C-alpha cells in the first residue's frame, strides 16, 4: 500500500515541486491550497494522469482564527478520507510581507503571518499525531532567521516559532516514531512581483553559483528527510542556502 | 530628570525584582499587572514611600486579541502620562503551562495566552515604544532552555523562540533610532509556587553552578547591566543567566 | 569514469561503513588508516573483490606535527595516484579521550592528537584537496553534542568546535570552485569497544528516537546524501543524525 | 586584600583597556606581553604610580609548542608570586592574519600561532588557573561575534575562535563545582588594524547598525568588568556579543 502525504500551499512554486517529487517517489498526495484552486486542480490532474486516484485537493485558509483548529483537523482528515492513512506532513504554506515597527490592521498581519508560519503548523502537527511505517513531518523553515530582512519582524517571529515547534515536536513525538525535521531555504524562487534588477541583487549574494535554489533543489532535501535514509534524523533543520547564511555584511 | 521604565508582569517574582532594581538605580517605573492588583499597588506604594511620584501601576491583559495593539499602546502611553518619557521597556510578563500535542481551556485560548504574552505583546509594545520616540533600550525576558525544551510545552516554547526572533529583528530595525534591544535568558530561577519541594530539588540539583535556582535579583542584575551605559554598544544580544544549565547533556 | 573518494580512519566502525556505502554508490575509495592495517587491507580486498581496482589503502598518522601537512598532501596524492582524480573527501578519523582540567601521555601529545585529528588534519586535507583541483565535496564528521559537552573532554570538544568553523569557512572559500563543504553530526552512534555494557545502556536509553544508538550505516546514509546530486545547493550545512539527543535537557 | 587578574596580550589595544579597567575596579594585574615590552612596562609604571605594587609584567610567546604548557603554568605562577592569589584570567592575546586554502611562514607555523594563541594557550592557562585554586573566581575569553559569518581566507583564525567557544562552554561545566565561572566577550568590529586606511575603516564601520562605528576598547572592557563582577555571579558558559548588531546583518 502506497504511503500518503499532505503538502500545504502545494499549488505553486516550492510546495508544488515538493508534491510532485513525493508523488514521483510513490506517495499519494493531498494538495492543500487557499486561493490557487485552478493551479491546485491542474497539478492533481497531472498527477492522477500518471497514476489514477493518487492526488486530491483540499482548500483551507490557515490564518489564525477561532476556526483554524477545525480547518487543520479537516486537512489531516482529508488525507485519511482519500487514502486511508497519513504518513507525511509538509508544512509549506506561508504568508510573507513586511510589517515595519515604525510607520491590513496589525491584528490581521499577526493572524496571517503567525497563523500560517507557526500556529497552523502546530495544529496540523497535533491533528497528524492524534490520528496515528515511516511517519514524519517536514517544516519549511528559513536559513536567514538569524540575519533577518529589515522590517520583516512578524514573519521572522513566525519562522523562529516554527524552529521551536520543530524541536519541541521532535522530542514529544519521538516515542510515537514520528520524526520532525525542517528544510531551511536561503534564496529560492523569488517573489513574482520583484523586479529583475532586485532579483539579480539577491542572486549575486549566494556563494555557491550566485543563483537562487530551484524549487526542485528544496524538494530534494524534503525527499531525503522523509526517506528511510533519514530514519535516525529528528529535530534537525537542513539549510539549503548555497552558503548564504555564512556571508557577513 | 529621572528616566522611566515599563516592566510588564512586575507585581511579583522576577518582574518585581526588576522593577525594584530599576527604581533603586534611579528609574521611575510603571508596574504593569494583569490579575495581581493588590501586589502591584502595594509595590507602587513601597516605591513611592522611598521617593514620591516615582511609581504607578498599569493594568492590562496581554492575551492575543484584536484589541491587544490598543492595550500595548496604552501601556506605553501610561508611562508618558505619569513621567513624560519612556526610556526602558522590559518584556517580562509571560503565561507558562503545558499544551501536549497528544491527548479545560480551548486551544484557541492557549494559543492566545502563550503566544500573546510571550511574543505578540512584546512585538506590539516594541512598536508602541518605538513610535513614541539618552539611553533607550528594550530587554526581553527569554529562556536559556529554548533549544532543550520541556516535554509538552510546545506553544510556550514557540512563544519564547518567537521572542528571540523579535529581539534580533527589533535590534536591527531600531538601531538607527539609538534603541538597543537585548534579552536575558534564565534557566532555573524562581520555581512555581505550586511545585512540591521534592520536584523543586530535582531541578535545583541539575544546575552546575551551585545546584540552586537563580534568585530574582540575579536575573535583575543582568537587566540592569543591559540598560546601563556599560552596555551602550550591545544590541541583539541574549545573555544567559543559567548557572551552566543549558550546557548539561541528558 | 568512476568518481573517487578519500575516507580517513576508514578501516573500522563509522568510517568503514562510509567507505562501503560510497563504494556501493559507485565510488573508488582510498581507505586511510593509522594503526588498523589488517582491517584496512581486508576491507580493500572485499571492495576490490566486488569491483576490481576500486580500493587502495593509505597509512598516515594525523597527529599534529611539522610533517602533518606533507602527510595530508600525500593522502590526497594517493587518491590521484590510484584513480587519477579526487572527487570526495570525508574527514572521519578522530582521537577521542578525556583531558581533565584538574588532575601517561603528556599534555603536548594530547593537544597534538585531539586537535590534530579533529581539526588540523581536516584543514590540511581540505587545502590539499582544493589545491589539486563534476560534483566535488567534503564531508566532515562533526558532533551533535558539541554544545552539551561531556565532562573532562575539553580538548576533544575544542577540536570538534574547530571542525564546525572549518566546515563553514571552507564552504565559503571553496564555493567559487564548486566545492561544497558540509558536515554530519552524530549523537550516540557506535559506542566505544572498551565501554561496559551497563554504561552503553545508560547512554542508549537517553535517545528519544528509539532509545538506541545510530548504526554506522545510518551515519553513512547522511554522508551519501550530502555527496549526491540531491544536495547540489547544500554547502556549509551540518546535519545532526542524533535521534533527538541534542534536544534533551538535563 | 585586593583580588588579582592575569590579562594576556595586555600591552596594547583591547587587552590594555581591560587591564586598566580591572585596575580601576580594584584588581592587581599581571600584564602579559610577547613583543610589546616597552608598552607593557609603560602600562605597569602608570598603574603602580596610581597604587604601589599593583602591576607586574610577564613575557611569553603563546604559539603552540612543546614548551607552551610550561609557559602557561609560569604565567599563572607569576600572578601567585606577585600577589599571592589569582582571581581572574582574561584570555585576550591573539594572532590574526589570513591563511588561504588555495594559493613566508610555513603552514605548520601558521597553525602553531593561530591555534596556539586563540585556543591552546587559553586551554593551558585555564588548566593552570584551575589547578592552582584546587571569593569570585572567573575566566573571560575574548571570542568573536562573527565566528559563524567568517572573513574570507581566515579559516585557521576562525577555527581557533570556534575552539575557544568550545573551551568556554566545556570549562564552564567542568569548573562550576569549584565555583570558577567561565564566560566570553565577543566583539564584532572593535579597534581596527593599525595599518588600515580611513576609506577601508569606514567601509567596515558603516556596516554596524548601532551608530555605524567600531566598539572602543573600553566598551569591550565594560563587558569583561560585568562578567567578573558580583552582578554576574550566576552567569557561566555565556558569551556576550558586543557588536552593535553586526552579526545580525545579512549579506
Ligand atoms: N522562496 C524563497 O526564497 C524562500 C526562502 C526561505 C524560506 N522559504 C519558505 O519555503 C516555503 C515555500 O516558499 P514559496 O516561496 O514557495 O511560498 P509562497 O509562494 O510565498 O507561499 C506558498 C503558498 O502559501 C499559501 N498561503 C499563503 N497564505 C496562506 C493562508 N492565509 N492560508 C493558507 N495558505 C496560505 C499560498 O497558497 P495559495 O496560492 O493557494 O493561496 C501560497 O501559494 C515557505 O514556508 C517559505 O517561507 C522560501
Ligand atoms: N522562573 C523561571 O525559572 C524562569 C525560567 C525561564 C525564563 N523565565 C522568564 O522570566 C520571566 C519572569 O518569570 P516569572 O517566573 O517571574 O514569571 P511568572 O511569575 O510566571 O509570570 C509573570 C507575570 O506574568 C503575568 N502574566 C501572565 N499571563 C498574563 C496575561 N495574560 N496578561 C498579562 N500579564 C500576564 C502575571 O501577572 P499577574 O500576576 O499580574 O496576573 C505574572 O505575575 C518570564 O518571561 C519567564 O518566561 C523565568
Ligand atoms: N561513535 C560515536 O558515537 C560518535 C559520536 C559523535 C561523533 N562521532 C564522530 O564520527 C566519526 C567516526 O566515529 P567512530 O566512533 O567510528 O571513530 P573512532 O572509531 O573513535 O575513530 C575512527 C578512527 O580514527 C583513527 N584515528 C585516531 N587517531 C588517529 C591518528 N592519530 N591518526 C590517524 N587516524 C587516527 C583510528 O584509525 P586506526 O584504527 O587505523 O588507528 C580510528 O579507527 C569521528 O569523527 C567521531 O568524532 C562519533
Ligand atoms: N579588534 C577587533 O575588532 C576584534 C574583533 C573580534 C575579536 N577580537 C578579539 O579581541 C581580542 C583583542 O583584540 P585586539 O585587536 O586588541 O588584539 P591584537 O591587537 O590583534 O593582539 C593583541 C595582542 O596579542 C598578542 N599576541 C599575538 N601573537 C602572540 C603570540 N604569539 N604570543 C603571545 N601573545 C601574542 C600581542 O602581544 P604583543 O604586542 O606583546 O606582541 C598583541 O598585542 C583578541 O582575542 C581578538 O581576537 C578583536
Ligand atoms: C532582506 C532580504 O530580502 N534578504 C535577506 C537575506 C540576504 C542577503 C533575507 O532575509 N532573506 C530571507 C528571505 C528570502 C526571500 O524569501 C521569500 C521569497 C519569495 C517568497 C517567499 N514566500 C514565503 N512564504 N517566505 C519567504 N521567505 C519568501 C531572501 C533572503
Ligand atoms: C521540563 C523542565 O522543566 N525542564 C527543564 C528543567 C530543568 C532542569 C527546563 O526545560 N527548564 C525550562 C523552564 C524552567 C522553569 O520555568 C518557569 C518556572 C516558573 C515560572 C515560570 N513562569 C514563566 N512565565 N516562564 C517560565 N519559564 C517559568 C526550568 C528549566
Ligand atoms: C559524557 C557523555 O558521553 N555525554 C553524552 C552521552 C549521552 C547521552 C555525550 O556528550 N555524547 C558525546 C560522545 C558520544 C560518544 O562518542 C564516541 C563514542 C565512541 C567513539 C568515538 N570516537 C570518536 N572519535 N569521537 C566520539 N565522539 C566517539 C556519546 C554522546
Ligand atoms: C572579511 C571581514 O573582515 N569581514 C567582517 C568585517 C565586517 C563587517 C568580519 O568577519 N569581522 C571579523 C574580524 C574583525 C576584525 O578583527 C580584528 C581587527 C584588528 C585586529 C584583530 N586582532 C585579533 N587578534 N583578532 C581580530 N579579530 C582582529 C572585523 C569583523
Automatic annotation (TrEMBL), chain D:
Ligand binding (NADP(+)): 12-14, 34-36, 61-63, 92, 94, 157, 161, 188, 190-191
Keyword entries, A-Z: Nucleotide-binding, Oxidoreductase
Oxidoreductase recorded as keyword: yes
Protein name: Pteridine reductase
Binding site for substrate: 138
Alphabetical list of SUPFAM superfamilies matching this protein: NAD(P)-binding Rossmann-fold domains (SSF51735)
Organism: Trypanosoma brucei brucei
Annotated GO MF terms: nucleotide binding; pteridine reductase activity
InterPro entries recorded: NAD(P)-bd_dom_sf (IPR036291), Pteridine_reductase (IPR014058), Sc_DH/Rdtase_CS (IPR020904), SDR_fam (IPR002347)
PROSITE patterns, A to Z: ADH_SHORT
Family: Belongs to the short-chain dehydrogenases/reductases (SDR) family.
Residues that bear Cysteine sulfenic acid (-SOH): 58, 72, 151
Residues that bind NADPH: 13-14, 34-36, 61-63, 92, 94, 157, 161, 190-191
Keyword Oxidoreductase: yes
Gene responsible for this protein: PTR1
Entry annotation: catalytic residues: 144 (proton donor/acceptor), 157 (proton donor/acceptor), 157 (proton acceptor)
